[PDB]
Amino acid sequence: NNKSQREELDSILFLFEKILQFLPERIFFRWHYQSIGSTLKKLLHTGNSIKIRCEGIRLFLLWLQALQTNCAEEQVLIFACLVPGFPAVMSSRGPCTLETLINPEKIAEDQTCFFLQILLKYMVIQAASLEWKNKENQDTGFKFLFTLFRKYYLPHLFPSFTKLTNIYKPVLDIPHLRPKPVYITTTENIYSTKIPYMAARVVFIKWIVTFFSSLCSIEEEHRMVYEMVQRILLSTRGYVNFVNEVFHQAFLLPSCEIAVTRKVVQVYRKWILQDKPVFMEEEEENTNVKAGVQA
């Protein structure tokens, strides 16, 4: 291999991205399905650098986004095993990971956030043409991706996830006390908790909050698309309930890394007693929320 060869393979990846963007309808018609799958599997080689693996994951995400709901079982299984460190997905063949699926600088299981930020800003590159297409294709791909992520990764990420929060039919109870998790007080000495899969919850809640605190438009190159994804997050009843439930899951984390809760406090300060969005203006049923502020 050479730097010229590295640039050639990067240009091959860029041409792959361009051919996915320029021809979404052809991809939706499973064009070169076996060839695309083989190319993705070859590019998903774990023996290369972190950049190569990230590019392969990005290309796989774009391919499944353009394919929408036409992805087969192996695409879903690969998608469910894209981020390592998670338990092997219970498939028909059996437990498996990405390494054994493709083969039938230390990673700190932080590839979840990189994967999520790749999914976000590359869903918004809008492989949908919008010509010979419709405006609905802007929202459909991201809705499908969010639904799949919530179906697969969310239940394991949130072991305490449950369905209580709902503005419509507002059933309310009285919360009670909770025990104290053990703090190892190890490694200024920052603290942590022995409960597995907690940093993933912190990252997920922080990202959800940053989409809502969603101020100052620092990036300035992906801001209209952030507004688009904000509308997607608040454009349906189900996503409304999901946002309320993730906020309820917030404020429940242990004392370690509690600054995320204050972010939710700032979000609610911006919402109530301030500019009130359509979210509080007075199964998905209607796009308009029209939820009373009292509930």
CB count, 10 Å around CB of 252? 12
Three-class SS of the chain: CCHHHHHHHHHHHHHHHHHHHHCHHHHHCCCCHHHHHHHHHHHCCCCCCHHHHHHHHHHHHHHHHHHHHHCCHHHHHHHHCCCCCCCCCCCCCCCCCHHHHHCCCCCCCCHHHHHHHHHHHHHCCCCCCCCCCCCHHHHHHHHHHHHHHHHHHHHHHCCCCCCCCCCCCCCCCCCCCCCCCCECCCCCCCCCECCCCCHHHHHHHHHHHHCCCCCCCCCCCCHHHHHHHHHHHCCCHHHHHHHHHHHHHCCCCCCCCCHHHHHHHHHHHHHCCCCCCCCCCCCCCCCCCCCCCCC
Q: CA-CA distance, 281 to 284, in Å (whole number)?
A: 18
Indicate which technique resolved this structure.
cryo-EM
Joined tokens for residue 265: 């406090």
Please choose, from the candidates 162, 163, 161, 159, the residue with its C-alpha nearest in 3D space to the C-alpha of residue 197.
Answer: 159
- Dihedrals φ, ψ of 59, to 5°? -65, -40
